[PDB]
Design a binder for this molecule. Structure first.
Ligand code: SF4
Lengths: 467, 159, 92, 164, 100, 270
């Protein structure tokens, strides 16, 4: 079909952000200024949030055969935009101390927002590929931003080779499915012969690298230690939040995901992700590796809901609310880590042994890390508990007894390291945009508390979005 | 057939090794007759200037570098022999250490002498060093009856 | 056809080469700055879309010219960006 | 057709084996160029007329030229030869070779299960990809241009110039 | 007259060989080389899949796949530039920190 | 005396034959042999797409343009394996800078050729040679024609003049370490290159096989001879341009010129 004004209003998120890249690139070539580039980039992402209202004026419809725009995609675009908003506000205080070329940062984050808001809208297997790679190239390059350290370049190179490897597995799987089926459109796929299933397993490999699943999780510690903390805010939250939407939509639409042959394999990956995350996560004394270890377990809880997407309609809202709670928890925690590095400081010295005290140093910021760190675990009065509660309900609904038991025993194992960091901020002690960065994490603390005690308004938004 | 001989007469590649003096006339000739000349590509080396004991190994390496068919033109009295510099620091001719084919006297020779050097060198190149039992005839002997028959010359008080 | 001409060319290459045989660590500041060639590596990939474009434009029409203008405007913005930052300048 | 396809496929296989067995890099780059030319021959034999000539102009004419530039400028030939051959023994080559061979036999068993339904070398001209690229697939092209801008900026950044 | 299986097993063989070259060697240049080899193998599989059905579905993402290959090779080569600029040793075991 | 212009080149070829070949020490051997044909066979097979006659066409293949661009890009490898086979950092950096300006100035020809293949709308050369039946595709595209001219003379045709010498010290032209038949192979390669660029220019820009009052194959041959003489006139007139000035008038001036050229042809064709 051609371009109609309905299609342009539907495409408005992908458009405002793209116009922002052009204006930011022209502004970089004009002046090369940090203040103007930060202002121009944050205005475009805020303009994308405003235009989410305008696409809500439009209904559930297609733009091209590549994309389908539903109300589900409206919420996922919003999650990615607040993470992009969150990462630029955490990057200005870290980059003020950087020695030179301080302006390429917002350009790459803007490209990654294009990639994230393109995996929200998906209907064809090719859009899946245009999105994964649009976000990886900034994540190829931003973990290597400030390569002057001996580990940022190390982290960039390890992530670079491995992410190209996953994309090559995804592309080879993407074609081996299309050999049987006449089209690669998600809906048109599956219209249980082994080549289609074999092609499907290859896409699971190429998707489970970025979702940090059990035999592909090896990158998640190292780059999270190596990357800058502003990059870790985006790498923990936005990428996997955007990626989880497209992998859920493929199994919802495709009739091959209805068959139990793929279901058993994904359940075992989810089982082992919880276990192989929450047991190796105990011994760590580094906060960045600690959050990277928890990421593997959080994506595992998302999978134990996704396996029962096909049994009961409550799994849609369950995945949605756990993603919202998981966004807020990780942004607050990673913002405090980045807010401790108020200058560039070369290599930031962050560790669990380095976080003795921190209440008599900065009391407000210690409270935010504690609230979010209790929210990661499953303690009530926090939004993580309501998200944990729906995934338990989904597993009970679909009679996945081993999987729901894994979440409980995984929660039982994983309570230990969250609580040490919560109490280690209470042992004996050994600029304007910085106040803005404090405001972002403090705003998130208020939100996770009020949506843990009072969780109904977030459910109303989620059922408003779900089709 | 002798097509191979025709090939070498028609086309030659000159390596100009003119030194401090004596090369301004060679340049005068070269810019009228002709960045093409390159080391280890030429088969003709026009040694000009005074050959010194100190820099003679340089000429011997350039002589060694060129291919098997090697031609050498000595121009000027300073290159044919030691010339006027019969001194401890000058070797008495480039013919002491490299074989030479054509000798062009003068100090410095003229561009027309360079033209006649190419004519005598294609003449030697067209008779196969090129002796061939035809080169015993010499320019001293060939134009002798031409030169002796000259009687009158212009008086030197005129231009 | 093309195959016959290719066989003729490779036979001539074999004939000339065989006939010829019978006839008888540290660079420091040197090199580097190939980034003009890296700009070519990326720009050839950009221009391959115009290579595919050039065959069918009459049926494309006004939206085709519009978004092709957008494409080359993005390339022009990137080019002036690289010029103004000092990446595309005098190079050894 | 059958003999030409078999011989160019075996040429590609031999070039792929050659590029993964030698030590000197420039020989490997030459053999990889040979493999890419063989792949473009396969593309033209299949009937993808806009693929075999598209691969050479860009994939084997700019990016491999960048590979040649970086392997030429490092000047790594003549240094660090012995220990690479010492470490890369056949015994450690067998290790992951069988591990990848399990993957190979699994995908061969997966692909032999389907029917053949053989297709002739159908010729596809550029007139119809000029429409299909411009039909539903316009935003793919636009976001690919943005992708290429992203590659340009991350290559400019992590390849930052300095005084040295 | 060649069916799909021969071309697909050829692409699978090149895929496996590129993966093996990515695994076995030490030089980061060689892992990038094997990466590009295996990207080309996946692209070959996509192209034979697209031209199998006899419509214009093979040239539509192959261009963007080689665009990804260009960008990835460029950023990897710049990483090699800055790695050899930092340290003269080009082995992967130099950058082998944070073990375990 | 020799009455023919080509007989000098003939004698040059005769001279390069029967010359003793020396082995280079501390050098690679496979690329020392393979680098000549990367420069020769490319512009030899660039001749394989000309419609010299409808009945004596050398190859009736569907695409010839993409093959030409494939040869344009392929040519660089000859300067690169020649630079590495020189095995002397001087000569290697000389070939690196020559390949630099080569890759720099090869960009323009494809985008300049997009105009004529867009107003032609096909890759089969019979369609192009039948398109120039009454109006040639040179009147509207002056800028595209001159840009393709500069690009065609910039691909190792000696107009840049950095091939056998180097403006920059610490490096040397890369035609020194070849002294056997390979040097004659280089010259004959650039000779078939200039004649094939002229033939492709006449058969793709102007109208081949018209025949107003005389048979059209000699009409094509005589027009090709006039463009040969004009190319030699401007090549000789063209002075050596130093490396800097070549970098200055490269990506800055002609990328916008060809982009507005594509805009103009796309606006006027509909
Ligand atoms: S021949 Fe004459 S001009 Fe030449 S070097 Fe000797 S004295 Fe000088």
């Amino acid at each position: 079909m051609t371009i109609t004004p309905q299609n342009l209003i539907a495409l408005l998120p992908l458009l405002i952000v793209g116009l922002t890249v052009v204006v930011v690139m022209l502004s970089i070539a004009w002046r090369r200024n940090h203040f103007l580039n930060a202002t121009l980039s944050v205005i475009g992402l805020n303009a994308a949030l405003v235009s989410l209202w305008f696409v809500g004026q439009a209904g559930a419809m297609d733009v091209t055969p590549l994309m389908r725009v539903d109300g589900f995609a409206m919420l996922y675009t919003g999650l990615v935009l607040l993470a992009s908003l969150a990462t630029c506000t955490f990057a200005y205080p870290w980059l003020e101390g950087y020695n030179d070329n301080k302006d390429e940062f917002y350009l790459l984050v803007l490209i990654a927002a294009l990639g994230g808001i393109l995996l929200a809208n998906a209907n064809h297997l090719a859009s899946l590929f245009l999105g994964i790679e649009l976000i990886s190239l900034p994540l190829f390059g931003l973990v290597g931003y400030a390569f002057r350290q001996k580990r940022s370049l190390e982290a960039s190179i390890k992530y670079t080779i491995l992410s190209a490897a996953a994309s090559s597995f995804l592309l080879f799987g993407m074609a081996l499915v299309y050999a049987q089926s006449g089209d690669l459109s998600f809906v048109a796929l599956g219209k249980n012969e082994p080549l289609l299933l074999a092609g499907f397993g290859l896409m699971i490999v190429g998707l489970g690298f970025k979702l940090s699943l059990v035999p592909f999780h090896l990158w998640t510690p190292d780059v999270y230690q190596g990357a800058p903390a502003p990059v870790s805010t985006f790498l923990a939250t936005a990428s996997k939040i955007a990626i989880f939407g497209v992998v859920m939509r493929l199994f919802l639409y495709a009739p091959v995901g209805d068959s139990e042959a793929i279901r058993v394999v994904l359940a075992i990956i989810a089982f082992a992700s919880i276990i192989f995350g929450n047991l190796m996560a105990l011994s760590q004394t580094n906060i960045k590796r600690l959050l990277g270890y928890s990421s593997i377990s959080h994506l595992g809880y998302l999978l134990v809901a996704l396996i029962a997407l096909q049994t009961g309609e409550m799994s849609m809202e369950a995945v949605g609310v756990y993603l919202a709670g998981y966004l807020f928890s990780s942004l607050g925690a990673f913002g405090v880590v980045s807010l401790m590095s108020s200058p560039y400081r070369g290599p930031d010295a962050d560790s669990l042994f380095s976080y003795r005290g921190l209440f008599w140093h900065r009391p407000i910021l210690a409270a935010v890390m504690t609230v979010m760190m209790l929210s990661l675990a499953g303690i009530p009065m926090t939004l993580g508990f309501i998200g944990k509660f729906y995934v338990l309900a989904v597993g009970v609904q679909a009679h996945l007894w081993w999987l729901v038991g894994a979440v409980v025993v995984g929660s039982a194992i994983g309570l230990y390291y969250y609580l040490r960091v919560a109490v280690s901020l209470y042992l004996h002690a050994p600029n304007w945009q910085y106040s803005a960065g404090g405001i972002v994490v403090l705003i998130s603390a208020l939100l996770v508390l009020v949506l843990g005690v009072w969780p109904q308004p977030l459910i109303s938004i989620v059922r408003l979005a779900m089709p | 057939n002798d097509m191979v001989n025709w090939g070498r007469k028609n086309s030659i590649w000159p390596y100009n090794f003119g030194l401090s003096c004596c090369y301004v006339e060679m340049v005068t000739s070269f810019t009228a007759v002709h960045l093409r000349a390159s080391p280890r590509q030429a088969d003709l080396m026009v040694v000009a200037g005074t050959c010194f004991t100190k820099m003679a190994p340089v000429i011997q390496r350039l002589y060694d570098q060129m291919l098997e068919p090697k031609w050498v033109i000595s121009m000027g009295a300073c290159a044919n022999s030691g010339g006027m510099y019969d001194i401890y620091s000058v070797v008495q001719g480039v013919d002491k250490f490299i074989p030479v084919d054509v000798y062009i006297p003068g100090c410095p020779p003229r561009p027309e002498a360079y033209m006649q050097a190419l004519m005598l060198l294609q003449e030697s190149i067209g008779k196969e060093q090129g002796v061939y039992r035809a080169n015993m005839q010499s320019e001293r002997e060939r134009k002798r009856g031409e030169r002796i028959a000259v009687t009158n010359l212009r008086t030197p008080d005129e231009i | 056809a093309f195959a016959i001409f290719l066989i003729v060319a490779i036979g001539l290459c074999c004939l000339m080469l065989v006939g010829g045989w019978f006839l008888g660590a540290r660079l420091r500041l040197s090199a580097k700055f190939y980034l003009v060639a890296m700009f070519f590596v990326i720009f050839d990939v950009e221009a391959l879309y115009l290579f595919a474009w050039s065959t069918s434009i009459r049926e494309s029409g006004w939206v085709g010219f519009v978004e092709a203008a957008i494409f080359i405007f993005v390339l022009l913005a990137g080019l002036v960006y690289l010029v103004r930052i000092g990446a595309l300048d005098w190079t050894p | 057709m059958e003999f030409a396809f078999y011989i160019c496929g075996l040429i590609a296989i031999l070039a792929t084996l050659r590029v993964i067995t030698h030590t000197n890099p420039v020989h490997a780059l030459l053999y990889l160029i040979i493999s890419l030319l063989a792949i473009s021959g396969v593309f033209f034999s299949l009937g993808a007329y806009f693929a075999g000539a598209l691969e050479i102009i860009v994939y084997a004419g700019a990016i491999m030229v960048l590979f040649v530039f970086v392997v030429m400028m490092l000047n790594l030939g003549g240094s660090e030869i012995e220990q690479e051959r010492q470490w890369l023994k056949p015994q450690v080559w067998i290790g992951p070779a069988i591990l990848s061979a399990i993957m190979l036999v699994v995908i061969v068993y997966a692909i032999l299960g389907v029917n053949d339904q053989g297709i002739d070398g159908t010729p596809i001209s550029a007139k119809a990809v000029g429409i299909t690229l411009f039909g539903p697939y316009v935003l793919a092209v636009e976001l690919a241009s943005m992708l290429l801008l992203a590659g340009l900026v991350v290559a400019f950044h992590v390849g930052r110039e300095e005084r040295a | 007259m060649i069916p799909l299986q021969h071309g697909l097993i050829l692409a699978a063989i090149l895929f496996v060989l590129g993966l093996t070259g990515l695994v076995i060697r030490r030089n980061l240049l060689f892992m990038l080389i094997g990466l590009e080899i295996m990207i080309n193998a996946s692209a070959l599989a996509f192209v034979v899949a697209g031209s199998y059905w006899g419509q214009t579905d093979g040239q539509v993402m192959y261009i963007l796949a080689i665009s990804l290959a260009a960008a990835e090779a460029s950023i990897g080569l710049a990483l090699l530039l800055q790695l050899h600029r930092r340290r003269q040793n080009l082995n992967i075991d130099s950058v082998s920190e944070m073990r375990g | 005396v020799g009455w023919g212009g080509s007989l000098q080149l003939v004698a040059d070829m005769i001279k390069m034959f029967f010359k003793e070949d020396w082995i280079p020490k501390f050098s690679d051997r496979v690329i020392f042999t393979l680098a000549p044909m990367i420069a020769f066979t490319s512009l030899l097979l660039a001749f394989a797409i000309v419609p010299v006659s409808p009945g004596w066409v050398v190859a009736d293949l569907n695409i010839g343009i993409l093959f030409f661009l494939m040869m344009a890009g392929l040519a660089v490898y000859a300067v690169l394996f020649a630079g590495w086979s020189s095995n002397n950092k001087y000569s290697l950096l000389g070939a690196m800078r020559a390949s630099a300006q080569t890759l720099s100035y090869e960009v323009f020809l494809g985008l300049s050729l997009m105009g004529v293949v867009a107003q032609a709308g096909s890759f089969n050369m019979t369609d192009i040679v039948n398109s120039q039946a009454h109006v040639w595709n040179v009147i509207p595209q002056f800028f595209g024609f001159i840009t393709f001219a500069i690009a065609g003379v910039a691909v190792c045709h000696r107009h840049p003049f950095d091939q056998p010498e180097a403006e920059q010290e610490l490096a040397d032209g890369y035609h020194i370490e070849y002294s056997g038949m390979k040097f004659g192979l280089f010259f004959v390669g650039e000779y078939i290159g200039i004649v094939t660029i002229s033939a492709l220019m006449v058969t793709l820009f102007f109208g081949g096989w018209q025949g107003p009052l005389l048979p059209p194959f000699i009409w094509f041959a005589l027009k090709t001879a006039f463009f040969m003489m004009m190319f030699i006139l401007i090549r000789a007139s063209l002075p050596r341009p130093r490396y800097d000035q070549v970098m200055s008038f490269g990506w800055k001036i002609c990328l916008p010129l060809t982009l507005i050229n594509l805009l103009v042809t796309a606006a006027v064709i509909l």
